[PDB]
Symmetry: C3
Subunit: 161 residues, 3 copies
């Protein structure tokens, strides 16, 4: 009996402003589990109108902020609408520098926390994922948030008789 | 000809105390490759009695300590009993902050080394994996050790004639 | 309908010298997608002679250097010849400490940027991947560059009638 599953990494362009990290700009592309779209601060109604199988957005006001955080930290609350027809789980998140116009941005160390919640493949449920990252100081900067997605719909092949 | 394999990320709750990192508490849950159980400092006999397909524990006294380490470093020796019936390999380890009771813990930068050993799916062999991490200072703290597991039992599908 | 893909992590032994990171020594082994070989500064002709399905090398003079980098940064330009017959994409890169002869090396924090380019499974095309990492200071050191590879040849199984 053998097992296999699906994994997918997505680069989310972000901006850090003091305590808040947000998605900058808007991205729309296709992938094995369908069309993906991302854009900051969308409503639980707008997300539903977006023409895509997976829409990632955020809570404009990520109010939620862990106790013990300092000026070097920053938060974000991801909003996910999954209509891919596959259960999704985030297995990893990393904030990395970016290179734009031959210029390095987000040239800083980083570590990140993120809640583990199954991202149900429903059509009316918006799943929220809290993300809290630590950086070198409190300066603003642009960077990329790499989100590793894994599917829970595991393939199991057996050799029966 | 196409190939596919299985990957799985597990969050191990840990505690850092000077030079030693240990698993705090005990976790037991089910996953595609079976029931998983984890608990600090178990004997090579106790692990064998544990009712689970994959038991992760540690060497209470992780004696082994790389030369060149300072007060900011910490070690751990993972003990793994794999009865999942699948060859396993750790492809990644990261120490991240945790959020407990709305409180951030392990709010520190981190980098980790870990040995690459195939984790044989035997029933009497306990595989050991050395882990050495670097942190900002020598202060104690709680955090999460994210271990990425990959299977070596790769699925290969060909279209023969 | 379920989906599954293939992922593979490779440890590349590296050396950091000021602004340049290079592969130290030479590695040759077999893996699900074929034999892999790696060695620093190979020509676009030598790589082609190497007896392997996947050859990773570098641009001896990684000239390309992002603006905004300091003494703590370092660059590398990976050269990849993919003859595995599978489209490859790098989903992750991390620089970690190494342990040699019971000695920790590269005991430093780190963050890395890397371009996202599909690595076509052609036979005459050498794909280049820019990598820029940030470290604690400008000191030289040895370490390991963990490159996570994912395949684009996704397996899709449906239950038709």
């Amino acid at each position: 009996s053998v097992v296999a599953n699906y994994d997918q990494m997505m680069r989310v362009p972000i901006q850090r402003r003091a305590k808040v990290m947000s998605i900058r700009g808007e991205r729309s592309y296709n992938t094995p589990l369908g069309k993906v779209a991302m854009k900051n601060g969308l409503s639980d109604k707008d997300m539903k109108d977006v023409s895509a199988d997976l829409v990632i957005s955020t809570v404009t006001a990520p109010r939620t902020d862990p106790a013990g955080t300092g000026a070097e930290n920053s938060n974000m609350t991801l909003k996910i609408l999954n209509n891919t027809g596959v259960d999704l789980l985030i297995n990893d998140i990393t904030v990395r520098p970016t290179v734009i116009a031959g210029n390095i941005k987000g040239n800083t160390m980083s570590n990140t926390y993120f809640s583990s919640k199954d991202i149900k493949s429903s059509s009316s449920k918006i799943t929220l994922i809290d993300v809290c990252s630590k950086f070198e100081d409190g300066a603003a900067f642009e960077a990329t948030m790499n989100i590793g997605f894994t599917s829970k719909n595991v393939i199991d092949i057996k050799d029966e008789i």
